[PDB]
Amino acid sequence: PRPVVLSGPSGAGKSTLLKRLLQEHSGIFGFSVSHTTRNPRPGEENGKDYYFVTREVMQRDIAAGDFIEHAEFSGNLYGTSKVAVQAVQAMNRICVLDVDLQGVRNIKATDLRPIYISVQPPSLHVLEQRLRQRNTETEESLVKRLAAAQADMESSKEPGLFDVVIINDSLDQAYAELKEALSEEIKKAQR
Numbered sequence: 001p002r003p004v005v006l007s008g009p010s011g012a013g014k015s016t017l018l019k020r021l022l023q024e025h026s027g028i029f030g031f032s033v034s035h036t037t038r039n040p041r042p043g044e045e046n047g048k049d050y051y052f053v054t055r056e057v058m059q060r061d062i063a064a065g066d067f068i069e070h071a072e073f074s075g076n077l078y079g080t081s082k083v084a085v086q087a088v089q090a091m092n093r094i095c096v097l098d099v100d101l102q103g104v105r106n107i108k109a110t111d112l113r114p115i116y117i118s119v120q121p122p123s124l125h126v127l128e129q130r131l132r133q134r135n136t137e138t139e140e141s142l143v144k145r146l147a148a149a150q151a152d153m154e155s156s157k158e159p160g161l162f163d164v165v166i167i168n169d170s171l172d173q174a175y176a177e178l179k180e181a182l183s184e185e186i187k188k189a190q191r
């Protein structure tokens with residue numbers, strides 16, 4: 001069962017869409033718990049949304065070869081450990097990845113063989129509106145996520161990087177498209 005890489009610009013709505021997928025289809029989808037050095041937001045939980053560690057612990061894991069991939073985004077480090085992917089594969093479920101555009105390029109070089117799905121905002125205007133709506137970032141880190149949005153939206157339209165592109169306008173509309181886009185993986189996971 002091919003893993004699923006969900007990417008796109010920060011604030012498009014991919015975490016929101018993914019939580020709706022993991023809640024409805026918990027028996028077939030498993031979430032890859034990434035490591036991150038950023039502070040946890042209210043509502044997040046260590047070992048579930050992220051492995052929240054300090055930069056020192058993060059760098060030590062890198063020196064120990066713990067990560068399939070890692071990258072820096074808006075002044076913080078993020079990584080997909082080998083453990084995160086094997087933990088889902090040891091549950092016989094579809095490993096779903098939430099990574100940035102640099103994470104897509106890293107995973108592209110691996111043997112994971114995933115299906116790559118871009119989640120796009122309806123426009124750059126709605127993207128900025130969603131980045132500020134979440135309200136979980138300081139003003140300097142908010143602008144840094146805005147700076148990377150343009151190049152992330154462009155690359156989100158390239159077929160060399162993605163197999164599916166979904167416009168997250170309405171949540172109900174985007175969610176049905178994602179499920180339909182994952183029909184072949186849901187089929188393989190259930191058989």
Ligand SMILES: Nc1ncnc2c1ncn2[C@@H]1O[C@H](COP(=O)(O)OP(=O)(O)O)[C@@H](O)[C@H]1O
Pocket residue numbers: 009010011012013014015016017130131133134168169170171172174
């Ligand atoms: N289809 C949508 N319509 C309106 N708001 C949305 C939609 N999808 C997500 N949002 C809002 O955008 C904000 C950021 O979404 P999030 O899932 O964190 O995006 P990402 O995971 O891509 O960074 C959240 O507050 C969420 O409520």
Ligand SMILES: Nc1nc2c(ncn2[C@@H]2O[C@H](COP(=O)(O)O)[C@@H](O)[C@H]2O)c(=O)[nH]1
Pocket residue numbers: 007008009010034035038069070071073078079080098099100101102103104
């Ligand atoms: N390369 C990479 N990016 C990640 C990983 N985990 C989260 N990200 C990305 O880092 C950015 C920051 O997300 P947030 O800080 O809102 O959780 C998002 O683009 C998210 O997809 C990861 O393990 N690897």
